[PDB]
Each structure stands twice: as structure tokens, then as C-alpha cells.
Design a protein around this ligand. Sequence first.
Ligand SMILES: *[C@@H]1O[C@H](CO[C@@H]2O[C@@H](C)[C@@H](O)[C@@H](O)[C@@H]2O)[C@@H](O[C@@H]2O[C@H](CO)[C@@H](O)[C@H](O)[C@H]2NC(C)=O)[C@H](O)[C@H]1NC(C)=O
Ligand SMILES: *[C@@H]1O[C@H](CO[C@@H]2O[C@@H](C)[C@@H](O)[C@@H](O)[C@@H]2O)[C@@H](O[C@@H]2O[C@H](CO)[C@@H](O)[C@H](O)[C@H]2NC(C)=O)[C@H](O)[C@H]1NC(C)=O
Ligand SMILES: COCCN(C[C@H]1CCCN(Cc2ccccc2)C1)S(=O)(=O)c1ccc2ccccc2c1
Ligand SMILES: *[C@@H]1O[C@H](CO[C@@H]2O[C@@H](C)[C@@H](O)[C@@H](O)[C@@H]2O)[C@@H](O)[C@H](O)[C@H]1NC(C)=O
Ligand SMILES: *[C@@H]1O[C@H](CO[C@@H]2O[C@@H](C)[C@@H](O)[C@@H](O)[C@@H]2O)[C@@H](O)[C@H](O)[C@H]1NC(C)=O
Ligand SMILES: *[C@@H]1O[C@H](CO[C@@H]2O[C@@H](C)[C@@H](O)[C@@H](O)[C@@H]2O)[C@@H](O)[C@H](O)[C@H]1NC(C)=O
Ligand SMILES: *[C@@H]1O[C@H](CO)[C@@H](O)[C@H](O)[C@H]1NC(C)=O
Length: 527
Amino acid sequence: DIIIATKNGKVRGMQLTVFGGTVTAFLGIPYAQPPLGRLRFKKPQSLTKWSDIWNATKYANSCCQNIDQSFPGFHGSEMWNPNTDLSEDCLYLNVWIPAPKPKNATVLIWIYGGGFQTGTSSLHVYDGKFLARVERVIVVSMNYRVGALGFLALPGNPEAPGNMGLFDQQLALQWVQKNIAAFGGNPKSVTLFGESAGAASVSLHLLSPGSHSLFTRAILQSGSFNAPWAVTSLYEARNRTLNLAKLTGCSRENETEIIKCLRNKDPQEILLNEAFVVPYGTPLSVNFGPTVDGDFLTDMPDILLELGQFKKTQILVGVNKDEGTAFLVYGAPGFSKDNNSIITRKEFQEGLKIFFPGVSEFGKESILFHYTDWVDDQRPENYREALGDVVGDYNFICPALEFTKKFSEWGNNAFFYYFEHRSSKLPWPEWMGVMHGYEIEFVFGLPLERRDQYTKAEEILSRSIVKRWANFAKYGNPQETQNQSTSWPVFKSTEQKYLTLNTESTRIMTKLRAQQCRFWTSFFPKV
Ligand SMILES: *[C@@H]1O[C@H](CO[C@@H]2O[C@@H](C)[C@@H](O)[C@@H](O)[C@@H]2O)[C@@H](O[C@@H]2O[C@H](CO)[C@@H](O)[C@H](O)[C@H]2NC(C)=O)[C@H](O)[C@H]1NC(C)=O
Ligand SMILES: *[C@@H]1O[C@H](CO[C@@H]2O[C@@H](C)[C@@H](O)[C@@H](O)[C@@H]2O)[C@@H](O[C@@H]2O[C@H](CO)[C@@H](O)[C@H](O)[C@H]2NC(C)=O)[C@H](O)[C@H]1NC(C)=O
Ligand SMILES: COCCN(C[C@H]1CCCN(Cc2ccccc2)C1)S(=O)(=O)c1ccc2ccccc2c1
Ligand SMILES: *[C@@H]1O[C@H](CO[C@@H]2O[C@@H](C)[C@@H](O)[C@@H](O)[C@@H]2O)[C@@H](O)[C@H](O)[C@H]1NC(C)=O
Ligand SMILES: *[C@@H]1O[C@H](CO[C@@H]2O[C@@H](C)[C@@H](O)[C@@H](O)[C@@H]2O)[C@@H](O)[C@H](O)[C@H]1NC(C)=O
Ligand SMILES: *[C@@H]1O[C@H](CO[C@@H]2O[C@@H](C)[C@@H](O)[C@@H](O)[C@@H]2O)[C@@H](O)[C@H](O)[C@H]1NC(C)=O
Ligand SMILES: *[C@@H]1O[C@H](CO)[C@@H](O)[C@H](O)[C@H]1NC(C)=O
């Protein structure tokens, strides 16, 4: 039996057997008052003390969310769908501590992705027991509100201020600050890491002054706030908040009254309507996401980034080789996970309509032009690979690169990686390559489990990545100093060196996707 006293009461965890060792897991610790009733859409409220022994022995409810129903029974999609009950009562977190209890361990806080519409900390690929066992770090992860329940925005108005999901995250960071010492943790040594919308969240915590004292360092996997999907403007936010009020018959004039009306609607009603608050959706739509609330976010984050207004610290940033492909099978014509998705020119052209609906004709022509001068005009994968690259470059790679350039210009050490290994247990077909999110299992050390049909080469890659992540958290330097590893150079805005992660050869390369990103980062914003 293992009971830990925390500032709001006592929590009992459970022992886990890992690699002939032991990790203690505290699954499902509440960190806020359930945001129910009048608390729906408000910032997370402080939790009142309890007196019992809170049995934190299983993952808690995941936050309300729509589920991917596109490939029922297919592990490739369903591995991302929630694996606990959905409920508004979902403000909980998890802690993995090494056994024997550490003395002053570095803490790793995970923030999952999901487009700010989906996700949950309890997923199998977010299990922190391996990191705890292997690197003697403590791993924390939290559930935070997503979708309209997490980001509906009536700016100024506290009933619906926006960014509630971010303040959930923040409230969990405070919990780590006030309690992790009791678990053997070092509150002065906290590294946030997250993927996709989780990564954009991490990057917004570097910008938010209310978070500056809640962590030390930051890791951003396939995501950053300057990505086009990561921040809703005050305009869209209001137009989307107003739209949703219509589809639920909640339209009023008293802005506080439309919120009260939305407060008596059932979570399901709000959920089915989220999709249509935009006129033309894409597979990448983030109908309700972070906004400039004037609280968490005091100005538009591009301006903050550009003028050096963020926490000064080290960052680890990276992306995957095929960020875009995963979204092509959610709408792009001629694409399917069940055939090699050879598409024609017209099909590529139609796909751009799917992914760039509001963009001018000339804008879409300019995308086609920049991506369709072929090394081989006769190669039939040409247009299929091109659309994937378009989506990946525009949505993930180029914003992550631009974020890393701008952040490092203010003097801090930055490290950039390019993950280019396809999981041998990847259930999607080969033409989709090194997909969005399929580095996570490697970061969390799943390939270390020899019982799980990963190759030996994958075990070695996960083992080095785990060491590099942990070295970055403990020491601000993501080296593997022992097994004659390739040294990871800092990313500088001049030379722009990055490290490639793969089973073959880790290499130092320069200026990732240079020609592509100049199009996205300096021509395309004009159109
Ligand atoms: C701001 O919102 C209006 C309203 O959107 C419509 O109503 C919602 C409840 C939802 O069902 C949406 O899908 C609707 O489109 C947008 O106005 C509509 O725009 C579309 C296409 O642009 C048009 O076909 C509709 O007739 C419009 N309806 C009205 C009442 O004007 C408007 O475009 C949004 N603003 C922006 C910049 O997108
Ligand atoms: C690849 O598959 C897509 C998806 O269509 C579905 O999946 C197939 C594997 C098969 O089960 C089809 O019967 C399904 O409809 C194909 O796209 C469809 O193509 C048909 C004609 O071929 C067209 O009428 C539909 O509109 C298309 N639907 C979509 C969503 O694109 C595609 O043609 C296949 N291409 C190759 C090269 O295999
Ligand atoms: C409910 O269905 C909505 C569609 N979603 C996408 C699907 C398809 C792609 C695979 N993912 C699983 C997945 C993989 C990796 C990390 C996290 C999750 C689910 S989404 O809601 O998850 C979504 C939305 C907008 C985004 C905008 C920018 C980047 C990612 C986005 C994801
Ligand atoms: C909390 O759990 C207590 C005991 O839990 C069980 O016994 C221990 C030794 C572990 O094996 C644990 O995994 C078991 O589930 C209960 O006695 C107590 O009533 C519980 N309190 C609740 C449910 O509120
Ligand atoms: C635990 O360790 C603390 C020092 O943390 C270290 O310094 C900060 C600035 C970070 O760089 C972090 O990564 C380092 O590991 C001590 O100040 C503290 O008193 C120690 N407390 C206990 C109980 O061991
Ligand atoms: C490093 O490699 C270990 C096994 O390799 C042997 O030990 C190291 C220290 C070298 O001296 C090498 O020449 C030997 O062949 C693994 O057990 C260990 O987990 C690896 N560590 C990392 C971080 O990858
Ligand atoms: C909006 O509602 C609040 C709370 O009831 C009220 O105080 C305020 O006057 C209303 N504003 C209007 C009606 O413009």
C-alpha cells in the first residue's frame, strides 16, 4: 500500500511491474472542481479539500468530445478514440513515480493533442510507466476540456471567456508545483511536452505569463501556436459562438443569457452542432480553439513571438516526415487507406479545394505551381505525394520551423529533429509514410517492451529518444552521451542544423524544406 498526502487530501496509488521493476501509478487525481452546471464554460475552479483516501487507481472520465467514426473497427483510427467514459466531470490527472520513490526527480508533464477537439490522457500511447521506470523521471499527464466546452469564446465575458482548456492545463501545472515534491518530484525541474494541439498548447504556455513560473523547459512534437489551425481570431470565435447559439435555439441579445441557455443544453446537443459553426469545414478544422482572451493570451501570439515576449528557456522542437498524409483519407477525393491512392491532376486540384476552401483561385493555383514542377513528370505518385506534402508543410513543418527560428533569435538554445521512421506496427498503409502522431509511441518507450512485436532496431531508437528527451528535461541538452551517438547541435537561425531520427543513420542536416517553407511563410500569407 502506498498513500501520498497532498494539499487537498490523501491519495492511494497502485504498484506496477515494469521491466523487472516497479513503478507507482496514481491514475485519476482530481485537480479542479468538476466544471458542471453553472461552471460549464467557466475557468476551472479551485478544488475543495477532501478527507478520505482518494483511490487513484484507474484512469478517470475523458472530457466530452466527438469520436472519429470514419474507420469503425480499424485500430489505426480507433487507437486515438477515448478509452474511458466521456463526461463533463473530467478534470483529472495522472502521476507515474519511479520505485523506489525518487528523492528529487525531474518531472515530465504531457499535454495530448487532438485538434483541441479530441484527446485524453488515458490513451495507451501516453502511458508514462516506461519513462518513469527507465529514466527515473516522474511523468504527469492531465485531461483538459476540448471543443466548445473547452474553448467557446465570448471575449471579456467570464461566463465564456475562451481558453478554458488552457486554464485547465495551467491549473494542473499549479498542482504539480504545489504537490509533486510530496511524490518525490522537483517542482523546479518541470519539462512540458505535447504533440500536435498538445504541442501548440506547450508553445502557448511559453507565451502566457501566468504559466512562466510553472515549468522549466518545453518540448514541441509536430505543433506550435503559429500553425494556421492553432489560434482562432476574436472574429471567428464570436461568429462561431453566435452560430452555435443558433443551432441550439439559444440565440439571444444578452450575451450572458445565450450562455445560460447553452448551460442547460445537453453535452451531446452542443457536440453535434460544433461541426457546422463554420461554413466550409476541412479535416483540419479547429472549430473551437485558443483565442486572444486578454487573460491567458494578452495579444496575438505571432506579435509576441516576433518581439521576443515569451519565457526564455530551452526548447526541443520537431516534426515527422509525413505529417500531412493522415488527413488525406478524411475527405480528399481519390484517397483511401485501402488502396495506394494514386490520384490525377484534377484530383489533386480538387483536394486543394477540400483543404483550402476559402482560398482564392489564384491562391490554389500558386500552391499547385509551387508543388507540381516534377523531377519526374511521369512518376504516378507525383500528385499523391504532393498533396500530402502540401498539407504537412503548411500545417505542421513550416510553422514549427518558423517558430524555432524566431524563438532561438532571442538567445536560447533550441534543438530541432526530423522523425523519419515508420513504425513496423503502423496499421495504416505504406503510402502514408511516417504519419502524424506516430513518433509518440517511440517517445513514450513502448518499443522498449519486448513483448510487443516492435523490431530490435525500434527498441534501440526508442531507447535513444527516451534518453535524449530525459536528458533534455533534466539538463536542457538532448544528448545521448554514452553510446557514441551523433551529437545534436543547437538550432541557429543562420545554419539551421537539425537531427534526423531513424533506425538507419542519425544525421545532421541543414535547412529543412527550405524552398517549400519560403512559399508558405512569405508568399502564401499574402493571398
Ligand atoms: C458567420 O456566420 C454566418 C452564419 O453561418 C451559417 O449559419 C450557421 C448556423 C451554420 O449553419 C453555417 O454552416 C452557416 O453558413 C455565415 O453566413 C453564411 O455563409 C454561407 C457561406 O459563406 C452562406 O451560404 C449562408 O447563406 C450565410 N448565412 C448567413 C445567415 O449569412 C458567415 O459566412 C460567417 N462569417 C464568416 C466570415 O465565415
Ligand atoms: C481508391 O479508393 C477510393 C475510395 O473509394 C472506396 O474505396 C475503394 C477501396 C472501394 O471499396 C470503392 O468501392 C469505395 O467507394 C476510390 O474513390 C472512389 O472511386 C469511385 C470510382 O472508382 C468514385 O465513384 C468515388 O466517388 C470515389 N470515392 C472517393 C471517396 O474518392 C478510388 O477511386 C480508389 N483509387 C484507386 C487508385 O484504387
Ligand atoms: C472527431 O474527428 C475530427 C477529426 N480529427 C482528426 C482525426 C484524423 C487524424 C488522426 N486523428 C488522431 C490523432 C493523431 C495524432 C494526434 C492526435 C490525434 C484524428 S481531430 O479532431 O483529431 C483534429 C482536428 C483538427 C486538427 C488540426 C490540426 C492538427 C490536428 C487536428 C486534429
Ligand atoms: C479504496 O480502496 C480500498 C482498498 O482497495 C483495495 O485494496 C487494496 C489493498 C488494493 O489492492 C486496491 O487495488 C484494492 O482495490 C477500499 O478498502 C476502500 O473502501 C476504497 N474506497 C473507496 C472505493 O471509496
Ligand atoms: C531539489 O533540487 C533543487 C534544484 O533544482 C535544480 O535547479 C533548477 C534551477 C533546475 O535547473 C533543475 O533542473 C535542477 O535540477 C533544489 O533547489 C531543492 O532544494 C532540492 N530539494 C530537495 C528536497 O531535494
Ligand atoms: C547503450 O548500449 C547498451 C549496450 O551496449 C553496450 O554498452 C554501452 C555502454 C557501450 O559500451 C556499447 O559498446 C556496448 O556494446 C544498452 O544496454 C543501453 O541501454 C544503451 N543506452 C542508450 C541510452 O541507448
Ligand atoms: C446581460 O445579463 C446580465 C446578467 O443577468 C445583466 O446584468 C445585463 O444587464 C445583461 N445585459 C444586457 C441585457 O444588455
